[PDB]
Symmetry: D2
Subunit: 457 residues, 4 copies
């Protein structure tokens, strides 16, 4: 099985027996990917165990994979481990169950439904401020991922189930506890590496009701939901929206529980981690932070409360957000299984091959980005934003399987940043890691957690 | 997983934990199936481990499965174990590789190509006679499966590769040895039962290059073929026909080796075992045997050599053959995986369910057959043959995945039977098992091997 | 493998393929064991999967197993699953690592060291009272396992590491949280039953650093200990005692962490569950409760604080405790692997066979106990205590591998019961389950949790 | 687990994750071992998967392992795969079953019993001659392993069961066929390498009655023996000797079948392969061959038939044999599992570590052997034989677990060589591989099979 790329005249690094090239993940996906791109060119291959994975960096080729032949050929992502009933979550589901599921949950994420969610996310914007000011009034360096974790959790709890907790001060609410265990997967920790070497063991685990989702969190929420379900039934949030949907092919109950869980998992560490990357960049580029605080005050004078419309109004805000995702695209890669022997843009792809787009590397490619490591929001000026290829810059992926939660993720984050910058300024501490070193692990996240000083305006 | 049939209001026997109903295979597939049909009605379910298997006996419903929605829904059979490169044999291949493969091998089985193969199969008809007469001249009771095994092997060797061995007298020819190990699979022996309980182990075995096809036989033939291939290339048989085919999507070389192997496996014990069932029936119904010997002598007077055309000429011959397959349909069941949630003839079939047609039981069903256990060829008289439902009587299955080798199997067998009955008469011995008890195992085959007395006409 | 007992002329129930007799655990170990004893006699066998397990109820035979040939033949218990570094905990360790470990931890459990621990366990006796009175003053039915759980945890935290938490009011102390997850193992839950059917999977799990001890609790305590270790080093409890021991074959650090963990696991739900069984019995036998409260007040007048010496002073106290363990011997069984072909008291035991003593059943055997189901403490009167066979009554097992923590467990429990009965009386509620039904699961524990009314004296 | 040798300050090559150093077996055990010895010194370690294996080359240390603490510590060899009932063969059995089994089979291999076997092995010496002369009279280059295979098989068949076949001319005798499949194990073929990486899969295989001994050969012999057993019972060979032994702790029947099988496996390819190595050396050192033919003719004039006593009479014969085993010690390594934490000759060996003696390398060590690659029988002259350390030269191992079949193996081989050299001379062909390259695989055997010219004296 290790001769496939050698036969198709595709270049790449040499796979050791059983391991493939996984030993080369010792500097993380990102670094490996950047190195590979440099050595091998526009396309290359490698092996995750016996799994062949082919990399591609041609925007046209990418578009065909992610848009054109999405339905016919490149419809699903790669399996990664045992999942139990979470087999039915949309980000995991495959082919027709997916298309079906994608349909039942899309109206939930309209610009319409989203404009309705704005006042709630706004209320926890406030709760954030109060908590921050408590630390700002006690001149003690702040850990963002905490305060932001607390926030991002606060907004999920309230927008998916309408449970309204100040998780930062109520860390020990059972509803807060279980949900905090739903953290992004380290695909380079002991366990998943083994799965990569012995995927033949995945079935043995499924048959043991072992799941990568801790059996206790899921069981907590399954019943939590079936309570909420039958407390609102009968007597505005994602659950409501999903309960309304199965009031017609219609969403099953366990299906409904599954999605709910994934929304938490999806929004939680991601909204948290991204907000952290942005405060780091703002504090190490004080000019940008000033330019922002002034735009914010112009649209929203007297520290006016942001709205759905005043948010899309702000352009330097969108630029700062976008540039950050360029430097830190927390998905790192996009991936699709090739379900048929196909030929796309002149290249034969055999079946079962996993096709991969190395986002991190591309967002940091000198051939598309002047001074790529530098933090320069002006790349996204309405003057230069046009020059940017949508299939090189893909922080939310692209095509029928792009991030369903993108509009929501972007607003969530911006509503926070405004209210925060309306009130404080963020200054580097001595214990602040400048320049931020990235984790050599399997998540896009800082080597050392970001600590900053905060001051009241 | 064991609640599926209970939910769909389908009846059946209660599955024990992990085993399902496999413990009920202690009297073999056939008996279990007959019992089930009687208890539970027109449709029922059971579990091979965790695998749900639904039985169906409505001819309409059957037709939809085997013909109508063959391509869309019910395209493949159930996996059964580790297969290695034999993954590419047609009877094993799935979906598009299958349709493709089915296409490249069909012209090989035309009435045209078959009429060309007749003189070769005829030559080993002769070799059979000589061997039989040696035993007939030495009044020693004969074991058919041997003499017939020897024959059926002789015809394969010669029709697939043109190697011409008298295997009965050359039992120790390397080409004869390897090929005799390709015997039908006992799906109720220790090994396959475990596979049924731990299908999650199948992948562990594949990854150990362990295959249910002994790694030595296959390796013998792979190279045997790549010799023949390059001895004829360059300087009438199935190999020729397949080599000509890849002289164009065209048949690969290892693909070609795979099919060759399956043709042997397919034709060998089957042509042998069926010919045995027929001699048993003939000898325990001496009237039928006389009626046959007289028809044979009328079409072919002076013991004239049968031809392609004189063979299709013989009608009592076809009746005797057909009735035998009714009583002994060596496939026992037909099976299809349900690849989508579907509804056929008013019944909801969830995905992944294996759908099954219990041939043996149906061929022995009193509601379609008067005195079913009795051996009465007149059921297939051109007068009554019309009254027989093609979707109740299915010894070669039906629809796009029916037995590719049916015409060939039927002629093979008839060419033998004529030449044999032209010369001898077969009389029961005292050591003959009357009435023939069927094996309680996982193959349709006699409990005790068939021994008969043979006399020269 | 399933023919072993059939060959040795030992009776028992018939094992199904792969499962053995595990299907007969549907009414729990206890019931199965009681039934078996009745049907089959003094000795019998059955199969946990392919594992042969032989039961024995002859006190002599038992003594040989648990005492005489302990070292030579019956030294270890049966493996049960993947354990990681907890392979080194004493209750799990085998043979020479065990004997060694047993030696390094025994001085920790002297009558000497124990008399020193009495004032600390006394302080949380007090904390218990206050908490109870809060519920007693608010006439709301009380759940014992909670209040007692809280207590039993309080005493462990303080006696193993000197951390002093009121866990009932501090439920959300990180030290309290992790440790509450160390609960007795349900050997009849989905997971362990599978392990019993596929013990061949245990090694696959070990090789995945999966452990039946949640990898987070253990990792919390490993470092927690290595802090305490290096905070006391340098600047009375089990840790001290173990740190002093490795200040010499001497206790390693990870070895030390392992034992610490097992002491928690051991003492926690056990001290809790037993105290619960006793309050149930006391409240459904009000006479006994009065007789006790009067003995307590005689030794300790003016609600005097109990001491080590006033505790061993109390005889009706010991009787009540003992009788409870008769009815509820929370270990249920004792077990030893037979490491050699041996013959003990006239019976040939082949190697690898697990030998078992069915405590629950024996403690409830009419041939040794008049009215066994009845609760009658007088069985243990210094007059009748003599008539009781130590190898029929074994709540703490017996011999070199008996419960290392017995003296400590007994004092712990009695110190609680005195202080509690000194202050309140416990009366059945309407929601109280009379008579207590036992869990049909794999732990000795009540079907419904015990709720009682509590009143201030 | 990969840090063990690093901790004990033992040197060696760096293990990759999961594989250990197995990738370094690409030039075979022998080469790896020679390289290691050179780099790392007198002792070193490496990992076969996760299995630590420590090498040792100090003769004293070796003696302690193989003799002194054999019983107490280093009693068994390493498991290698699934074995089924062959678990009971002596070379596989462990600890007390071994000691027992070793005792019941030792009297079978006395100098006494051996002197009785000499005339039978002599008769097939003759059959060899006739076959050789047929090739010698038809000047066609000869393949030794064949003719010798044929011989070595002939002598086993006759000495273990008294079945008397000329296997070279009867290649197709069922008794000859099955037994020829019992060939030495390639511990570097796909299968065993996987076992080395996933030893956790060995139990899954055992539970599938899969055995590294083909289930058909063993089943053939099991019944073959139980026939012979009951044909001689009732109405001189190893079977007789074992049947007599169980006529007394006494040999069971399946136990008996197991040993019989191992004797075949043991003697077959080994006697064959060694005889081949010797003819190669003789023909590439024509001087030695002449010196031998003259000694042979002196003890046995007029081509007199060798006897037990005339065989031990011949000293250049013993020298030639011995030197060959120096250059080609077909066991390659000796191995013992360390069953306890021990310290031997100043070195701490933790438990479970496999201890290894690299025979091949040591026999070719310049520090003990002048011109080691050269073939010089005079090393074993009764003058220099004294200077040779028995714990450096170990072709049959040493100590309580040395080759049980050594006396027999040596006589077998010498009886052949005499009768052969009495009649022919062996001259290199052009197609002869000079100098013989060794297989880079996992058996000591020539890269290309040895072909020589043979001439009649
Ligand atoms: C900063 C925040 C986020 C970023 C940068 C991000 C990025 C991504 C990316 C790159 C993908 C894969 C797209 C592809 O495969 O082409 C994805 C998938 C997905 N995201 Fe997000 N995402 C974010 C937040 C969220 C949030 C808040 C939700 C809330 C539900 C969400 C729900 C999903 C779902 C359901 C998928 C898989 C869609 C499918 O398979 O049909 N994401 N995201
Ligand atoms: C007495 C002889 C035979 C009988 C009674 C018989 C019967 C059957 C039956 C019932 C099936 C399954 C049909 C279905 O799934 O609906 C089958 C499949 C098949 N048979 Fe035969 N068969 C015979 C001989 C042969 C021979 C001689 C060949 C020679 C190549 C052959 C080749 C095949 C193949 C390739 C399949 C699977 C077809 C596919 O999956 O595309 N069979 N046979
Ligand atoms: C009500 C409380 C308890 C009861 C009824 C109880 C009973 C038992 C029983 C029956 C055994 C098995 C004995 C055998 O195999 O023969 C045992 C083992 C053991 N118990 Fe307890 N036990 C209790 C509490 C404790 C406590 C508080 C500790 C504190 C450390 C403890 C530590 C242990 C250990 C370490 C073993 C295994 C000993 C060894 O394998 O060397 N137990 N217990
Ligand atoms: C040229 C022929 C042979 C050579 C060079 C040879 C060499 C060896 C070696 C080096 C060992 C391992 C010794 C150790 O572990 O220290 C061994 C083991 C063994 N050999 Fe041989 N051997 C030969 C032939 C035979 C024959 C003909 C038999 C006939 C039965 C035999 C039976 C055994 C047995 C049973 C063992 C394992 C002994 C035990 O584990 O108790 N060997 N041999
Ligand atoms: C439906 C089931 C599972 C209950 O039973 C059967 O499969 N019966 C056997 C006949 S269909 C398929 C059969 N296996 C081939 C695919 C797997 C390996 C070879 C076969 O076709 N083998 C060659 C063959 C056999 C008999 C008739 N024709 C061809």
């Amino acid at each position: 099985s290790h001769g496939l790329f050698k036969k198709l005249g595709i270049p790449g690094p040499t796979p050791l027996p059983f391991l493939g090239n996984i030993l080369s993940y010792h500097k993380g996906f990102c670094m490996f990917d950047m190195e590979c791109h440099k050595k091998y060119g526009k396309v290359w291959g490698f092996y995750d165990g016996q799994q062949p994975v082919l990399a591609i960096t041609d925007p046209d080729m990418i578009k065909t994979v992610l848009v054109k032949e999405c339905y016919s050929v490149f419809t699903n992502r790669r399996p990664f481990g045992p999942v139990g009933f979470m087999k039915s979550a949309i980000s995991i589901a495959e082919d027709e169950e997916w298309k079906r599921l994608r349909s039942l949950l899309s109206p939930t994420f309209t610009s319409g439904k989203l404009k309705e969610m704005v006042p709630i996310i706004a209320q926890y914007g406030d709760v954030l401020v109060r908590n921050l000011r408590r630390e700002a009034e006690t001149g003690k360096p702040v850990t963002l991922k905490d305060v932001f974790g607390a926030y991002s959790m606060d907004v999920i709890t309230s927008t998916s189930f309408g449970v309204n907790i100040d998780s930062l001060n109520n860390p020990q609410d059972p509803f807060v506890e279980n949900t905090k265990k739903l953290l992004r997967f380290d695909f380079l920790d002991p366990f998943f590496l083994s799965i990569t070497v012995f995927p033949f063991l995945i079935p043995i685990l499924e048959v043991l009701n072992i799941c990568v989702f801790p059996r206790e969190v899921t069981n907590f929420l399954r019943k939590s939901v079936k309570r909420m379900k039958e407390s609102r039934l009968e007597d505005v949030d994602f659950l409501q929206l999903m309960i309304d949907s199965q009031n017609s092919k219609a969403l099953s109950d366990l299906e409904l529980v599954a999605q709910s869980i994934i929304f938490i998992f999806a929004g939680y560490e991601t909204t948290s981690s991204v907000l952290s990357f942005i405060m780091y960049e703002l504090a190490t580029h004080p000019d940008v932070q000033q330019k922002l605080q002034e735009e914010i005050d112009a649209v929203l004078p007297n520290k006016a409360p942001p709205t759905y419309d005043t948010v899309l109004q702000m352009e330097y805000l969108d630029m700062v957000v976008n540039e950050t995702l360029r430097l830190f695209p927390i998905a790192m890669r996009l991936e699709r299984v090739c379900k048929k022997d196909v030929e796309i843009n002149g290249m034969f792809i055999p079946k079962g091959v996993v096709v991969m787009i190395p986002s991190y590397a591309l967002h940091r490619d000198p051939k598309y980005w002047t001074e790529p490591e530098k933090f320069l929001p002006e790349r996204f000026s309405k003057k230069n934003k046009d020059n940017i290829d949508p299939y090189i810059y893909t922080p939310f992926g692209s095509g029928p399987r792009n991030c369903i939660g993108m509009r929501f993720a972007l607003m969530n984050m911006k509503l926070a940043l405004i209210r925060v910058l309306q009130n404080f300024s963020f200054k580097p501490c001595k214990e602040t890691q400048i320049p931020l070193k990235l984790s050599l692990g399997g998540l896009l996240q800082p080597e050392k957690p970001v600590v900053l000083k905060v001051e009241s305006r």
